[PDB]
Amino acid sequence: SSINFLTSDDDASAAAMEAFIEDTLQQRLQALIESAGENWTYAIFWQISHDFDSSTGDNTVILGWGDGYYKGEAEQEHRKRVIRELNSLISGDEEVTDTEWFFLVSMTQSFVNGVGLPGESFLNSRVIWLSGSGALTGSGCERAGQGQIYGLKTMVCIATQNGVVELGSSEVISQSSDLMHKVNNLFNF
Protein backbone atom coordinates (compact mmCIF):
# COMPACT_ATOMS: atom_id res chain seq x y z
CA SER A 1 0.00 0.00 0.00
CA SER A 2 0.91 3.70 0.20
CA ILE A 3 3.67 4.74 2.60
CA ASN A 4 1.47 7.31 4.32
CA PHE A 5 0.53 4.66 6.86
CA LEU A 6 4.00 4.32 8.44
CA THR A 7 4.36 7.94 9.45
CA SER A 8 1.81 8.97 11.96
CA ASP A 9 2.20 8.22 15.59
CA ASP A 10 4.02 5.11 16.49
CA ASP A 11 6.97 7.04 17.81
CA ALA A 12 7.60 6.41 14.17
CA SER A 13 11.11 7.73 14.32
CA ALA A 14 12.25 4.96 16.66
CA ALA A 15 10.79 2.41 14.31
CA ALA A 16 12.52 4.07 11.33
CA MET A 17 15.87 4.36 13.13
CA GLU A 18 16.36 0.65 13.88
CA ALA A 19 14.89 -0.27 10.49
CA PHE A 20 17.18 2.10 8.55
CA ILE A 21 20.01 1.64 11.15
CA GLU A 22 -2.45 19.52 17.37
CA ASP A 23 -3.49 16.36 15.42
CA THR A 24 -4.12 14.98 12.93
CA LEU A 25 -1.03 16.58 11.47
CA GLN A 26 -1.36 14.16 8.60
CA GLN A 27 -4.77 15.17 7.37
CA ARG A 28 -3.75 18.83 7.66
CA LEU A 29 -0.48 18.15 5.82
CA GLN A 30 -2.51 16.20 3.26
CA ALA A 31 -4.99 19.07 2.90
CA LEU A 32 -2.11 21.49 2.50
CA ILE A 33 -0.57 19.90 -0.61
CA GLU A 34 -3.84 18.47 -1.90
CA SER A 35 -5.15 22.00 -1.48
CA ALA A 36 -2.39 23.42 -3.68
CA GLY A 37 -1.86 24.35 -7.33
CA GLU A 38 1.79 23.42 -7.72
CA ASN A 39 2.88 19.77 -7.88
CA TRP A 40 4.30 19.25 -4.38
CA THR A 41 5.80 15.83 -3.73
CA TYR A 42 5.37 15.70 0.06
CA ALA A 43 4.81 17.71 3.18
CA ILE A 44 6.38 16.88 6.53
CA PHE A 45 5.75 18.47 9.92
CA TRP A 46 8.69 18.81 12.30
CA GLN A 47 7.55 18.96 15.94
CA ILE A 48 9.28 20.49 18.97
CA SER A 49 10.65 18.46 21.88
CA HIS A 50 13.29 19.12 24.58
CA ASP A 51 16.52 17.23 25.21
CA PHE A 52 18.77 17.55 28.24
CA ASP A 53 22.39 17.30 27.25
CA SER A 54 24.74 15.35 29.50
CA SER A 55 26.87 17.06 32.10
CA THR A 56 25.71 20.62 31.39
CA GLY A 57 22.26 22.24 31.24
CA ASP A 58 20.58 21.91 28.99
CA ASN A 59 17.15 23.10 27.97
CA THR A 60 17.79 22.37 24.30
CA VAL A 61 14.97 22.67 21.80
CA ILE A 62 14.89 19.86 19.21
CA LEU A 63 12.86 19.32 16.04
CA GLY A 64 11.75 15.80 15.21
CA TRP A 65 9.41 13.81 13.04
CA GLY A 66 5.83 14.75 13.85
CA ASP A 67 4.08 13.46 10.74
CA GLY A 68 4.13 13.77 6.97
CA TYR A 69 2.16 13.01 3.85
CA TYR A 70 3.55 11.83 0.54
CA LYS A 71 1.73 12.63 -2.67
CA GLY A 72 4.30 11.65 -5.31
CA GLU A 73 3.80 12.21 -9.06
CA ALA A 74 20.48 -0.46 -8.53
CA GLU A 75 18.79 -3.80 -7.95
CA GLN A 76 21.09 -4.18 -4.95
CA GLU A 77 20.02 -0.70 -3.86
CA HIS A 78 16.48 -1.79 -4.45
CA ARG A 79 16.54 -5.02 -2.43
CA LYS A 80 17.99 -2.96 0.41
CA ARG A 81 15.17 -0.43 0.00
CA VAL A 82 12.22 -2.90 -0.09
CA ILE A 83 13.74 -4.85 2.84
CA ARG A 84 13.70 -1.77 5.07
CA GLU A 85 10.22 -0.81 3.84
CA LEU A 86 8.97 -4.34 4.66
CA ASN A 87 10.78 -4.08 7.99
CA SER A 88 9.29 -0.70 8.97
CA LEU A 89 5.76 -1.82 8.08
CA ILE A 90 6.45 -4.90 10.26
CA SER A 91 7.67 -2.82 13.19
CA GLY A 92 4.86 -2.07 13.30
CA ASP A 93 7.26 -6.22 -5.05
CA GLU A 94 6.45 -2.54 -5.73
CA GLU A 95 9.39 -0.25 -6.64
CA VAL A 96 10.84 2.26 -4.11
CA THR A 97 11.66 5.49 -5.89
CA ASP A 98 14.14 8.16 -4.80
CA THR A 99 11.57 10.64 -3.42
CA GLU A 100 9.62 7.92 -1.60
CA TRP A 101 12.89 6.79 -0.03
CA PHE A 102 13.95 10.35 0.97
CA PHE A 103 10.49 10.80 2.50
CA LEU A 104 10.93 7.62 4.59
CA VAL A 105 14.53 8.24 5.70
CA SER A 106 13.52 11.72 6.86
CA MET A 107 11.58 9.94 9.63
CA THR A 108 14.95 9.12 11.21
CA GLN A 109 16.20 12.74 11.36
CA SER A 110 16.23 15.49 13.99
CA PHE A 111 17.54 19.03 14.31
CA VAL A 112 19.06 21.05 17.14
CA ASN A 113 17.22 24.37 17.14
CA GLY A 114 19.12 26.80 14.89
CA VAL A 115 20.79 24.03 12.87
CA GLY A 116 19.86 22.70 9.40
CA LEU A 117 16.96 24.12 7.38
CA PRO A 118 14.33 23.07 9.96
CA GLY A 119 16.32 24.41 12.95
CA GLU A 120 17.32 27.65 11.22
CA SER A 121 13.73 28.15 10.22
CA PHE A 122 12.35 27.60 13.71
CA LEU A 123 15.03 29.55 15.57
CA ASN A 124 14.50 32.68 13.50
CA SER A 125 10.77 32.18 12.85
CA ARG A 126 11.71 32.17 9.21
CA VAL A 127 10.50 31.09 5.76
CA ILE A 128 13.40 29.46 3.88
CA TRP A 129 12.49 28.85 0.25
CA LEU A 130 15.04 27.00 -1.90
CA SER A 131 14.03 26.72 -5.52
CA GLY A 132 16.26 25.08 -8.14
CA SER A 133 19.02 22.46 -7.78
CA GLY A 134 21.78 25.06 -7.24
CA ALA A 135 19.67 26.62 -4.46
CA LEU A 136 19.67 23.24 -2.64
CA THR A 137 23.34 22.34 -3.24
CA GLY A 138 24.41 25.95 -2.42
CA SER A 139 22.45 26.06 0.86
CA GLY A 140 25.04 24.58 3.22
CA CYS A 141 22.37 22.30 4.65
CA GLU A 142 22.93 18.56 4.45
CA ARG A 143 19.19 17.78 4.34
CA ALA A 144 18.77 20.13 1.38
CA GLY A 145 21.82 18.46 -0.16
CA GLN A 146 20.33 15.01 0.53
CA GLY A 147 16.98 16.08 -0.94
CA GLN A 148 18.75 17.26 -4.10
CA ILE A 149 20.54 13.87 -4.46
CA TYR A 150 17.13 12.20 -4.37
CA GLY A 151 15.73 14.42 -7.17
CA LEU A 152 14.21 17.38 -5.30
CA LYS A 153 14.48 20.79 -6.90
CA THR A 154 12.41 22.73 -4.36
CA MET A 155 12.56 22.45 -0.60
CA VAL A 156 10.76 24.83 1.77
CA CYS A 157 10.68 25.14 5.59
CA ILE A 158 8.07 27.38 7.24
CA ALA A 159 8.18 28.15 10.96
CA THR A 160 4.81 27.61 12.73
CA GLN A 161 3.72 27.82 16.39
CA ASN A 162 4.39 24.15 17.23
CA GLY A 163 7.20 23.45 14.72
CA VAL A 164 8.18 23.67 11.06
CA VAL A 165 6.22 22.71 7.94
CA GLU A 166 8.46 21.37 5.17
CA LEU A 167 7.40 21.17 1.55
CA GLY A 168 9.44 19.54 -1.19
CA SER A 169 9.05 18.85 -4.88
CA SER A 170 10.93 17.37 -7.76
CA GLU A 171 9.77 20.48 -9.66
CA VAL A 172 11.09 24.06 -9.53
CA ILE A 173 8.33 25.87 -7.64
CA SER A 174 8.01 29.61 -6.87
CA GLN A 175 6.37 30.82 -3.67
CA SER A 176 2.64 31.17 -4.04
CA SER A 177 0.87 33.93 -2.17
CA ASP A 178 -2.04 31.52 -1.49
CA LEU A 179 0.06 28.62 -0.22
CA MET A 180 1.39 30.69 2.71
CA HIS A 181 -2.07 31.54 4.03
CA LYS A 182 -3.12 27.86 3.91
CA VAL A 183 -0.18 27.12 6.23
CA ASN A 184 -1.54 29.75 8.66
CA ASN A 185 -5.04 28.25 8.78
CA LEU A 186 -3.83 24.68 9.04
CA PHE A 187 -0.91 24.99 11.47
CA ASN A 188 -1.34 28.06 13.71
CA PHE A 189 -3.94 27.90 16.54
Binding string, 57-86, against Ca ion, x = CB under 5 A? ---------xx-------------------
Task: For residue 15, give the 3-state DSSP assignment.
Answer: helix
Site for Ca ion in 20-59 (CB under 5 A): none
Least distance from Ca ion to the Cβ atom of residue 8, Å: 6
**Closer CB to Ca ion, residue 126 or residue 146?**
146
The interface region with Ca ion, picked from 2-10, 26-34, 103-111, 138-146 by CB under 5 A, is 2-10
- 72-76's contacts with Cβ under 8 Å and 24+ in sequence apart are 72/41, 72/42, 72/97, 72/99, 72/100, 73/39, 73/41, 73/99, 73/170
**Closer CB to Ca ion, residue 78 or residue 181?**
78
State the number of binding residues for Ca ion (CB under 5 A): 3
Distance CA 137, CA 135 (A): 6
Least distance from Ca ion to the Cβ atom of residue 175, Å: 27
Beta-ladder partners of 31 = none
Distance CA 118, CA 144 (A): 10
Task: Tell me which residues touch Ca ion (CB under 5 A).
Answer: 9, 66-67
